[PDB]
């Protein structure tokens, strides 16, 4: 099947190793979603895939046992790559007010679809990514930018709901 | 209408029961549990955050449901007609200490090695069952530590001359 779509997408992004030791594999292919699987399945990866980036220009991907999160690596931006980090390795679970979750829940905790941080409908903010740098205040995904305690939210596209808190557990829950 | 089946953790012969009538649960005939994993993916017309849904194969029909079966007040029940599927996005991906309650779907060893399943005896034979002390969470070949007896989750391999390894998994503290 194709799996591009389980992945985290960052657009206009790539990642620059660092560290000389790091494993990397580049393949030209046709389109995004032939990495993707390949990716998923670790077929013809002597490492564990964790994330790959499809260059649009050259039509090539790199697949990485790393992520944005590893050291020794760099992430940073490029117009001609697309980023897919495996959901596997990008947690999705807050220890104290979700100061730094960085997962993909962009629903609130009463079902609404979050509107995008950087658009001002239904609602205007100031919550630029631009002012919040390590925040990863991208798509609508639910964060904390502020670290307040609530834990992850998002301001909704619900008119009359400004923001409201996600559902995101807590990592000691089980 | 892109296919999600697979973004979510399946246990069949599986439903979930919960009090609390307070929740809310939406229910709709299908053809496919293909249908209900969309629609919980994206979330769309759910007025809640779906964690889990319920495909009933007898009745064609799913329940959407705010919690899964590690919500406070959630207790599993047996059905030949029903399968269950939790969201990934809700099911822990990284562990605490030793991980002995690690209930992911990661199902390769650290050196990249396809975890045998622990309802196969091939190629390794052991007394990890059932109903036994150690066969707790035991579910298809998913990296488990029992009784954090190892350094972290682990499985037995597929491969003859690697009883067993452990797997990579992130702890949560660390990023």
Redesign the interface.
């Known amino acids: 099947?194709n799996?591009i779509?389980?992945f985290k997408k960052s657009a206009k992004t790539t990642l620059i190793k660092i560290d000389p030791a790091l494993k990397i594999k580049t393949k030209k292919v046709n389109t995004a979603d032939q990495c993707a699987n390949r990716c998923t399945r670790?077929k013809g990866l002597?490492?564990?895939c964790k994330a790959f980036v499809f260059d649009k220009a050259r039509k090539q991907c790199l697949w990485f046992p790393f992520n944005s999160?590893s050291s020794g690596v760099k992430k940073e931006f490029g117009h001609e790559f697309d980023l897919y980090e495996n959901?596997?390795?990008?947690?999705?679970?807050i220890?104290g007010k979700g100061r730094?979750y960085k997962?993909?829940?962009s629903?609130?905790?009463?079902?609404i679809?979050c509107q995008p941080w950087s658009s001002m409908i239904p609602h205007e903010h100031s919550f630029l990514p631009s002012s919040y740098r390590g925040k990863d205040l991208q798509e609508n995904y639910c964060r904390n930018p502020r670290g307040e305690e609530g834990g992850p939210w998002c301001f909704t596209s619900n008119p009359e709901v400004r923001y409201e808190v996600?559902?995101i557990?807590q990592?000691?829950?089980?």
């Open positions: 099947r799996t779509h389980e670790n002597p490492f564990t999160m959901k596997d390795y990008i947690r999705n679970c220890i730094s997962g993909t829940v629903i609130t905790k009463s079902g679809k996600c559902d557990p990592c000691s829950e089980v």
